[model samples]
Target: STGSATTTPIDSLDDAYITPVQIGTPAQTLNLDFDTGSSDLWVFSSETTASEVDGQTIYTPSKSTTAKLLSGATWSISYGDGSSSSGDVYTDTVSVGGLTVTGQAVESAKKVSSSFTEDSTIDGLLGLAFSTLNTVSPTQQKTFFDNAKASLDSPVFTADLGYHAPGTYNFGFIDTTAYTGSITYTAVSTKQGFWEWTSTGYAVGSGTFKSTSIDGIADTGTTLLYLPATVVSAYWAQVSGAKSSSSVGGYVFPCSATLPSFTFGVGSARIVIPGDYIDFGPISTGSSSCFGGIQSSAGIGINIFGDVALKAAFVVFNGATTPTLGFASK
Candidate 1:
């Protein structure tokens, strides 16, 4: 079924935004990526050992004047790409966009991959997706909202995605302007940290792929969108006679093509992906691959609608209740 009609175009973001949370006393401020794929408040901290502190963006504890570390709690997150990190929980007064959320839980890394260390600018990811998927799993059951829900009035949240514009997407505030009034609330799946959904098939350049494809679950938590190789091949096939490039790790076509539009069916919601997204060329030359979307863990997992998908809709994650997601527009 086609979800409520009327999809809006989001501007964009070049640099991540600053949203405040009160962690401890003096209030430690940090930079975060407003993610919708999952719910977790991950940040670099002074408590994290130098090893874990290497490549990640570390927030100086002394700078905050109110940062406090969690004693004896160790956090280790392992990614499917054989990347992992270790850290301990720390409490501090975290603030974003002037909205102060107190007693926020942040993970201080002990050990991390070179990829993480290499990108020191990428502070930590602040997942605004769901309440249940916070990284503080097993050890701590409470999420950012669970701990500080009282601070919010309506307890409603919204993410305003935009174009290469810095600080456009602020965490927490619901975008009232995008609302079309037809809201679709889907119960949070009690499964994993990632959003997993079934796609009826795929579409490229307005044409649906002949083969059956499973749609991906929308995850504002993650950065990149992952699609099946076949789907990627099918998508590129229609665009510029391009083929999948193993070296590129996905597929890439000539930059000149009109780029295809890919759509995924979620129940009745046909999430239409824009074409320019497919035009995100590789990070460097000789890396024929483009950045938009890639063919990675296809069979491993059907698809992950990262930021690409979130920008397409006005998402309202209502944690005011028992962590349910409501879709509306501004």
Candidate 2:
């Protein structure tokens, strides 16, 4: 069956869009972040530390009659930058929008960071990436999409993210009206368990195109776009007084500086990012300088076309036996 759900950005920063999911017997509804950057459906639950449950809703399996323990199964994930979460696993009925998947694996967090606790908008994160990235041990678990695909009209999902407004995620079918022009298809490498693809090149505003191929992941979980220093430097170089600041974090420019739009190529397809979206708001509340959404991926190891880039176009996650990605103008 085909289904669709709307997601709204928690703030004007376009930080992360969250949607609702009903889990357990009588349907315990919780707002969750649907992320394509990682593959673990974990929630801040009753098992979490008292201090970690600050302003968020916790999933309490004890109240759900259909919830079952996964016995000895456990899962742990870390950002490598010190932030981490670990927990026990359970099996429960889960539903998103009009679609339902039974016996879904739900990881309940026992530990997490104070920073994660501060983000009250997300009670949990439901990853859409390939199942190979699932951190559960002893036996791996399939993601929500993987389990729901069997009953879906098609094994596909589409992300139509909006700026400062609500967007939608359509499961099983593509709405042609959601995007303009024909979609350009490209091979996806799930070797890293990500929606990883290569870009033909990039251009800063109306500048000449750089034809070098860039490999990056389409990550909905990440808030900013990270690229090679060369590409990032070329972009920042266009703005006056823009420079890297380890203190303020990444690249910063005067808030009033005029920004040029960014355009990247996907095969023959071209997707443009509006300059305003690139502004990414002022750096730390009314500061004179603002942070650029596009930054360096030098230290991050892999390049990421995060929400900064994703919100610019309509993305298709064609989950076929040989997975592929599609991008279209919007």
Candidate 3:
């Protein structure tokens, strides 16, 4: 007993990862984004309008013998980037790799915004956040991890995100061979339904480490790392020809610029982000201007350690006792 799934990057964007999940009897498999920032397992279903469903696969609960509607229950969810979906609820059998959870709540999306419809490949999202954040009305729904943790040999899951390669989402056990160096564990606070932690300090390039505490969340779903404006500005200043451009959005620098490495303090662990990773990509295709992957989280009110940052290490979301984050260099 343990469950495991191979996570692959959707595109070279390194924005998101998709994993196959089995839902309902006879197994209707759907590609889902394993998101750690939110709670709610929702899928594009029969209820979704034909126009709303593009090249994505749909989950038909009606065709599943084990699917049962939860009377008077409904769900609605919105992401930080303004993506949203809402629909009714159903209880069914959901499985991930070898682990299966019976009577798992599944939200069927009847309405999806343009954000979801445009991304035709992703069928839905499998939330790994705390159950308390579930948007189900009348009753909260437990995530696949929460429901299966009791039966697991160990109550933990690991996120191994890669730059442009395939990674793995492991459950019940940690794969020692996946990472090098000793794993550094730091306590996490789930007060806001996220794997939130405070960085002890940070440094620009090989500069002196400042003891400025940065409160942020470890979000796998987010595409880029987000920090305070001051921090972002300081990092940009070190890059030649880097400037904040309203037209380019955020901070952009010459594509040929050799940016300096950035580091964040996690307890005694200093996770370093290579300079090359900081340059997301060209501001646009065939353009010499490159946009920064690290931006200001001013409007969001919270810093985010997104894929750009998470992929730098092997992260363990240990939910056993006091939820902790274990980071190890790849």
Give the total clashing residue pairs for model 3.
Answer: 0
lDDT of 1: 0.55
Q: Which pairs of residues clash in candidate 3, taking residues 3 or more apart in a chain or in different chains?
A: none
Clash counts for the predictions, in order = 43, 0, 0
Stretches of candidate 3 off by over 4 Å are none
* Candidate 3, 1-330: lDDT as tens digits: 689899999888776899999999899999999999988999999999888999899999999999999999999998999889999999999998778999999999999999899997799999998888999998888998999988988999999988888899999999999999889998799889899988888898999888888989988889898999999999999998999888876889999999898998888878888888787778889999998988989878899999888988899999987899899888
- For model 1, the superposed segments whose C-alpha errors exceed 4 Å read 1-25, 37-40, 48-57, 62-65, 129-138, 166-173, 179-181, 195-202, 208-215, 266-269, 286-296, 320-330
User: What's the lDDT for all of these models?
Assistant: 0.55, 0.90, 0.90
Estimate, for each residue in 1-330, the C-alpha lDDT of model 2 and write its tens digit: 887889899888898899888999888988888899888999999999988888888899999998999999999988524567889999999988889888999999999887678888988889899999999999999999998887888789999999878899888999999999998989999999999999999999899988989999998888889999999999999999999999977999999987998999999879999888888778888789898999999988999998889988899998988889999989
- Ordered list by lDDT, greatest first: 3, 2, 1
What's the true lDDT of residue 77 in model 1? 65
Strongest candidate by TM-score? 2
